[PDB]
Input
Amino acid sequence: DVVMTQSPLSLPVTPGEPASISCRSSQSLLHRSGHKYLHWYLQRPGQSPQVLIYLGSNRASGVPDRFSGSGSGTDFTLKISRVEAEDVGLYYCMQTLQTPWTFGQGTKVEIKRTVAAPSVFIFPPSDEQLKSGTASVVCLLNNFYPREAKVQWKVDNALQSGNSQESVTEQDSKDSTYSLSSTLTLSKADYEKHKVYACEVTHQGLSSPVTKSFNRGE
Amino acid sequence: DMVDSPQLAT
Amino acid sequence: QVQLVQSGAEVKKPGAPVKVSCETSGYRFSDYNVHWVRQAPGQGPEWIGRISPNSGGTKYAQKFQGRVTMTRDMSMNTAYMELSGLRSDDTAVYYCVRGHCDGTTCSRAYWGQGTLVTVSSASTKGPSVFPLAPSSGTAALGCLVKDYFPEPVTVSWNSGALTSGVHTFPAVLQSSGLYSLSSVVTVPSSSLGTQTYICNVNHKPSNTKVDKRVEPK
Output
């Protein structure tokens, strides 16, 4: 198999500024007939890969003029002259000189903005949920940049493990921020056994970790 | 069939 | 235009086979190879194999050899891909792709819209909706949509009237095999005594429509 190595893996770009994504192959993708078999495509969530640049340098129909591709037989580049929120997504290079087709690691393009601390909130489980025998405790982190944030859970001041899941929103088109939700899941039995419930949040924009908490039964 | 499509024109 | 059009999303149980179709138009079907790629969540894309429509000859990747079968119908301009012995690692979006070269000239690739294939033993289930009650500037409130299957659920606030401030989170798959998500909205603390906040959860597969009032505890 031909090995593609793509770089960089993450790329924050200020609005208006250009972006360059590199991709190199283990062997030449320039066939002796003259055609370079390397393709660049864009992956947004919940939709088909969009072909941007094909056969090295050719722009696909309906792709904006700011997208351009170049390279030698082994070293390639995707250039975007002015990045915008439309361009946010996961970029891939791929080779089709030989089957199996092989793909680069991927480049996650996002808009860059000033640092913004998350607004943290916590929510206890409802009465309606407790009578079914389960207790979910939610910790919302709202409108923050960059995406890297850490959420730790504490029950009677004791750190929790393996009993929580989180998911993160896409980057917002308008304010260029992220939001994350984490959920601490427990049985009704274990929930009633403890009193103090707290999520501790870590993020660049905060000087030291913020805590929000509640006591069971108020 | 083990012939990749870039080798069709040969 | 060149158009590749795939069949609907599939829920199968471990060990069942899935047969995806790929109907084509706008070009001579015989002239180009139909390649099949997939992308699993949390994984980079992966080439499964290829079929030549005219000859019928197929090439498969080593890892798929012995469990994938690709066929075609010339009359209906359709390519198929039957994968067998499904396990959770085969859960992915499966894409049929038109190849580049036809003998005379080499052009771009054209991709199908994708087909989601979910490998799971879970049965259809409606969610139970629970309020995320606002606390005693800016306040946050929400709805927790718990224990449903399959995806998706749609959430709206005050029947679409409230859109500003809304974050509907991606679902997470729990150990029980069922999905769960939360929808939240930030609002002014001034409005909590007066304004009514309802979330409208719809889950079509179980015919579930719920309207849950989220008020201060």
